[PDB]
Design a binder for this molecule. Structure first.
Ligand code: SF4
Length: 374
DNA sequence: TGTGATCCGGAGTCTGAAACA
DNA sequence: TTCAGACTCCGGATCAC
């Protein structure tokens, strides 16, 4: 019964990692998101070799330029994408990089889907056995294991665990451990889907925050006693702007879509009399984001572009008694957490927010963050 | 046959050199 | 002080020998 010890040692290590990151990085438990499965496949296409914020902004640009005229409904007109020339769809996702190659891959995927089934949809893939779905997804040109595992785990709710560069490095550095896939998949094949989802989410966030490739924050890492690099060893990055929290009954939020039932964070107002409103990411996207919105943090807000360009004149009486919270502006998640102490990261993730984007409400497209904020 | 390169590509940080002295 | 190149980012395909 060696496998009895094989699964027990990893389960104890995995649950210790999950419990510790719960206090530091907030609640990463599974919560459903809307959207179809073709959105997830295109997202995994767009996340090949690029940072997460760039890929998410590229998908937002795809949604904005091609708009729709767990509710499994398309947010993007994929028929128009297949109709659109490779040059224009490469222009849409230029900022992500590899625009032309990925545009051709996406057009080929959509064309093959139409040829196979006569319609761009993959809802029936949740009814087939998991292995058949994995083989069908692997049969596509431009998709490999790391992607199809992400698609299955985050969208099809199967039992899967993708091993990307961040996961492998963390596993090697910690007491754990295609070679990494062979070591981990048999040892991590029978666990609850919610547990796999939470582990994956906290692993990617931990790779972004504490355990980076260059100069990991080993001083403030909660896993110092369980690591090997720490065992063997022995600002312009972020701008903080204190803001006000706006209850949904406030007059300023009269025409702001009245949030979402499942959104865990409220609206914010960033005063410079004049203020800019910060719209939460889940509310701004109205759910319906690929891969269960694991591209954003739990405490992530956008910046209203119209409010940023022309701040709204507000009286000081309306915002007199509202509580005050930080936002920790910046340009990327890894940069704004560099050098931060454990208490600061915990406070930011539990009683704080994070903004690295600007959102245009009218066009639903990403915009660069304004100069004064960062 | 099993890696081992070389490609794709924008956007950012970060060094090292070439600079003040 | 300027400043350009290497490197990193939730990766596949195509040769080469
Ligand atoms: S101690 Fe350092 S190397 Fe180890 S897991 Fe933490 S950040 Fe990564």
């Amino acid at each position: 019964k060696w496998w009895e010890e094989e699964r027990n040692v990893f389960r104890g290590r995995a649950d210790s990692f999950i419990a510790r990151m719960h206090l530091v990085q907030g609640d990463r438990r599974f919560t459903p998101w809307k959207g179809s499965v073709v959105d997830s496949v295109v997202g995994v296409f767009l996340t090949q070799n690029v940072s997460d914020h760039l890929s998410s902004s590229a998908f937002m640009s795809l949604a904005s330029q091609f708009p729709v005229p767990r509710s499994t409904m398309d947010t993007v007109d994929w028929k128009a994408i297949r109709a659109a020339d490779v040059k224009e769809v490469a222009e849409t996702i230029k900022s992500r990089g590899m625009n032309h190659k990925l545009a051709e891959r996406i057009q080929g995927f959509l064309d093959r889907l139409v040829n196979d089934h006569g319609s761009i949809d993959l809802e029936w893939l949740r009814d087939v056995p998991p292995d058949k779905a994995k083989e069908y997804l692997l049969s596509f040109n431009g998709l490999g294991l790391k992607s199809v595992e992400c698609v299955r785990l985050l969208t099809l709710h199967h039992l899967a665990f993708p091993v990307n560069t961040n996961v492998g490095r963390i596993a090697v550095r910690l007491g754990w451990v295609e070679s990494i896939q062979k070591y981990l998949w048999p040892r991590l094949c029978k666990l609850d889907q919610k547990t796999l989802y939470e582990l994956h989410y906290q692993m990617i966030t931990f790779g972004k925050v504490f355990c980076t490739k260059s100069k990991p924050n080993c001083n403030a890492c909660p896993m110092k006693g369980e690591c090997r690099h720490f065992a063997s060893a022995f600002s312009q990055l972020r701008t903080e702007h204190r803001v006000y929290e706006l209850p949904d009954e406030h007059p300023l939020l009269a025409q702001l879509e009245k949030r979402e039932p499942d959104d865990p964070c409220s609206y914010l107002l960033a005063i410079w009399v004049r203020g800019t409103i910060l719209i939460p990411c889940r509310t701004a996207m109205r759910g319906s984001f690929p891969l269960n919105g694991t591209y954003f943090q739990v405490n992530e807000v956008f910046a209203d572009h119209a409010s940023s360009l022309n701040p709204i004149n507000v009286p000081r009486e309306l915002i007199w008694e509202l509580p005050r919270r930080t936002v920790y502006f910046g340009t990327s998640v890894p940069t704004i957490f560099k050098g931060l102490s454990t208490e600061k990261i915990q406070a930011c993730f539990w009683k704080g927010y994070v903004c690295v984007r600007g959102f245009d409400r009218k066009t639903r497209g990403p915009k660069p963050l304004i100069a004064r904020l960062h």
